[PDB]
């Protein structure tokens, strides 16, 4: 497994003079969700463009998701999959120039699974517990719902955070009531892995590069997997 995080091994809110609103941005009721679709193009040896359209607004008609490497790209290159990820724009490219615009386009990483025989019986949804810890105490516990029989940690994580934003101010437009925080997962087998929630100790925040962590498209088994979030107050 991934060993439990360390004190000075965690990012500190107090150290980010930036604007925590660009992080809130990626999880207050913001995700991309497509069902039963197939890649329809591609840029570099490892990203599959789909023709998924913005339902909420009118920002994109296509969605470039980038994966860990080339072979992980093909695993899905022409299969009917579902999608669940956080998209961004500032630095969403399709060529060589680094800050350039397009439209109907948006980027992400990971969030896809083979649709065939992965959903439930008659539309039933699965519930996933979340134990929240504030300063080491099980303060709040809720659950998350999904349609996958095996889903993208990203999906699950987003859904977690979105709630914490909507009910426990995990992120506020200027900063956050918390100093540190990480979302750790436990797999039925004993695999446990965690992901830092706080920005990088400095002035600005590259939205993108944060997310690049979701390019391992790592998946988990809803019906069993359990979640833990861990916070420390300012």
């Amino acid at each position: 497994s991934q060993p439990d995080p360390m004190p000075d091994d965690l990012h500190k809110s107090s150290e980010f003079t930036g604007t925590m609103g660009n992080m809130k941005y990626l999880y207050d009721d913001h995700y991309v969700s497509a069902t039963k679709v197939k890649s329809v193009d591609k840029f570099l040896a490892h990203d599959l463009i789909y023709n998924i359209s913005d339902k909420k607004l009118k920002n994109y008609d296509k969605v470039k998701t980038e994966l860990l490497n080339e072979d992980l790209a093909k695993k899905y290159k022409d299969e009917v999959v579902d999608v669940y990820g956080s998209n961004y724009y500032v630095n969403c490219y399709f060529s060589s120039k680094d800050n350039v615009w397009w439209h109907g386009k948006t980027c992400m990483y990971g969030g896809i699974t083979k649709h065939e025989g992965n959903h439930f019986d008659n539309g039933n949804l699965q519930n996933v517990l979340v134990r929240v810890y504030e300063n080491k105490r099980n303060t709040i516990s809720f659950e998350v719902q999904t349609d996958k029989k095996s889903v993208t940690a990203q999906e699950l994580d987003i859904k977690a955070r979105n709630f914490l934003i909507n009910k426990k101010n995990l992120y506020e437009f200027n900063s956050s009531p918390y100093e540190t925080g990480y979302i750790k997962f436990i797999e039925n087998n004993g695999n446990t892995f965690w992901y830092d929630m706080m920005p990088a100790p400095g002035d600005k925040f590259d939205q993108s590069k944060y997310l690049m962590m979701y390019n391992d498209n790592k998946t988990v088994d809803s019906k069993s997997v359990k979640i833990e979030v861990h916070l420390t107050t300012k």
Binding site: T19, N59, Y89, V90, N99, H103, F173
Partner: protein, 109 residues
Amino acid sequence: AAVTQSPRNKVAVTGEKVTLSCQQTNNHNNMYWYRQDTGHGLRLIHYSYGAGSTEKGDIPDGYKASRPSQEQFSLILESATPSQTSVYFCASGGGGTLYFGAGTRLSVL
């Protein structure tokens, strides 16, 4: 019609939550939100490189912004106060360009 703000003219009581809506048509990446001293110069509160991202300007304090789409940006004011009373201007800037809105004249009483 390059850049337009809304509303043009606003009188609100000290307290209420005021939002200023600005929208473009030349679709420039960079969009800006401004404010200047009563007949002086314009000073940066908040700006944005692209939808879903803002950065703190000169005088961030006591404002909220939001960019939900390449051509749209908004100035949020949770609890107003007379101090914040002034004339706001919106711009977009790109490929050697900078546009301005017609300004919003506000009143915090």
